Design a protein around this ligand. Structure first.
Ligand SMILES: C[C@@H]1[C@H](O)[C@@H](C)/C=C/C=C/C=C/C=C/C=C/C=C/C=C/[C@H](O[C@@H]2O[C@H](C)[C@@H](O)[C@H](N)[C@@H]2O)C[C@@H]2O[C@](O)(C[C@@H](O)C[C@@H](O)[C@H](O)CC[C@@H](O)C[C@@H](O)CC(=O)O[C@H]1C)C[C@H](O)[C@H]2C(=O)O
Ligand code: HEM
Length: 391
């Protein structure tokens, strides 16, 4: 029986020993998923990068109901279709719709909105009673408010979102996920009809121009919001932890915009809970020969973007936080057909956050120890349960 991927990591910002062992054993290796099934874990940079460009991996399985699962989640099950050409076309359309929204030009047009929301939230955060949770008081409201503004979700309708998005991340209750997913899909399909009638400068309105069916705009906007919210918030949090542990690198990043940009890359490479970094399931649509192994049609393949970021064949002293790594060859956003569509926004949001946070609160420090930080578990893209800081 293959080793089981565990529920989190023993502590934050260090790769879990089980993952480091799996990586040493083989480039592609059989594991047991949290959901109990068997799967291929890709553990090394060169092999992951090659498989990110292999057309034989798809979000498709001949029998999705019986396909080997990564996690027990009705969210993943919406992702997997039973025809390959139908899955390929659905994926292709998602990227065609969304890639223009995140061009360098359009992201540049988001900067004032992002900086302005960060300043309003930071104004309130600096006044909180200390120690204060940076995640609930800053990084989550920051991420939620920017993403809702860009997508076009009214301030008047945001109250219920943090509850529904958090529930959708649960691996603990299958029926609570599915009805939260429908609440969110229903909220945003309803919203799409309203913005069709009254368009604004936002993503939902621009999708209306090209997509005439509300019932398919809503799930795209919902999955856009779910894709960005926690990941951006968690990287604000862990980026803040790293910078409080290497204050000399924080100060030089504040002093030179080149080093703040490469500092954000080094946070994207290393600011990790240390647990399993695979995000979505992929299935072989044909047999693939690689790394002295044979992946078979229907097999589950897990691309662990976090784990390959610590591959010593690529990164000198990989456990070390060093913002001067350049070029920084992390694969945190994927690559090729699968590459994160929000990467330019995420990069800009993180740079905005660290700059404003540490300029306004230069004495920002952990209330307790890094070892005392509690990584969340039993969840999709959980990060920390809270991050108490003082300043
Ligand atoms: C075909 C389909 C239909 O037409 C439509 C009706 C279907 C809609 C279905 C949508 C389903 C969406 C499911 C998303 C699940 C994310 C899980 C994330 C878990 C992440 C993992 O976390 C772990 O999980 C383990 C279990 C725990 O053991 C462990 N303790 C920890 O918790 C790893 C962490 O990952 C990253 O965070 C970033 C992700 O967050 C990025 C993600 O968000 C993507 O961006 C989501 C992209 C997604 O949206 C693509 C869809 O859009 C494509 C799409 O819709 O196709 C349409 C055309 C960053 C962290 O550094 C990772 C780290 O920790 O090292
Ligand atoms: C630090 C923040 C983020 C990280 C680490 C991250 C990471 C990732 C990763 C690893 C994938 C590939 C998933 C897979 O195929 O296994 C992905 C895909 C995706 N990301 Fe991000 N992401 C971040 C922020 C965002 C944001 C803010 C948005 C939207 C505003 C977004 C939208 C998407 C979408 C739509 C996909 C699916 C792409 C596809 O199916 O081809 N991401 N992201």
């Amino acid at each position: 029986p293959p080793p089981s991927l565990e529920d989190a990591a023993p502590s934050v910002l260090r790769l879990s020993p089980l993952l480091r062992e799996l990586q040493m054993r083989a480039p592609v290796t059989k594991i047991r998923t949290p959901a109990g099934d068997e799967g291929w874990l890709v553990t090394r940079h060169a092999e992951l990068k090659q498989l990110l460009h292999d057309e034989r991996l798809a979000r498709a399985h001949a029998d999705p109901a019986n396909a080997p699962r990564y996690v027990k989640s009705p969210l993943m099950d919406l992702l997997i279709m039973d025809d390959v050409e139908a899955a390929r076309a659905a994926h292709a359309e998602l990227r065609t719709l969304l890639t223009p929204q995140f061009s360098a030009r359009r992201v540049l047009n988001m900067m004032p909105m992002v900086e302005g929301i960060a300043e309003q939230i930071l104004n309130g955060f600096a006044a909180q009673e200390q120690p204060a949770d940076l995640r609930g008081n800053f990084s989550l409201p920051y991420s939620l408010t920017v993403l809702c503004a860009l997508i076009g979700i009214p301030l008047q309708e945001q109250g219920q979102l943090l509850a529904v998005l958090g529930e959708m991340a649960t691996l603990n209750d299958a029926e609570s996920v599915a009805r939260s997913q429908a609440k969110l899909f229903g909220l945003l399909t309803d919203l799409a009809g309203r913005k069709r009638a009254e368009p604004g400068d936002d993503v939902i309105s621009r999708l209306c121009e090209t997509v005439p069916e509300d019932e398919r705009i809503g799930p795209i906007a919902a999955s856009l919001l779910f894709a960005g919210l926690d990941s951006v918030a968690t990287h604000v949090d862990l980026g803040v932890v790293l910078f409080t542990q290497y204050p000399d690198q924080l100060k030089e990043a504040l002093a030179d915009e080149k080093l703040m940009r490469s500092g954000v890359e080094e946070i994207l490479r290393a600011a990790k809970a240390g647990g399993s970094g695979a995000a979505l399931p992929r299935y072989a649509t044909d047999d693939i020969e690689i790394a002295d192994v044979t992946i078979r049609t229907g097999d589950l393949v897990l691309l662990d973007f976090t784990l390959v970021n610590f591959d010593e064949a690529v990164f000198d002293d990989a456990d070390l936080f060093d913002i001067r790594r350049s070029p920084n060859e992390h694969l945190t956003f994927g690559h090729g057909m699968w590459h994160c569509i929000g990467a330019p926004l995420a990069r800009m949001m993180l740079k905005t956050a660290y700059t404003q946070l540490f300029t306004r609160l230069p004495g920002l420090k952990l209330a307790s120890s890094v070892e005392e930080l509690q990584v969340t578990s039993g969840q999709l893209n959980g990060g920390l349960t809270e991050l108490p800081v003082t300043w």
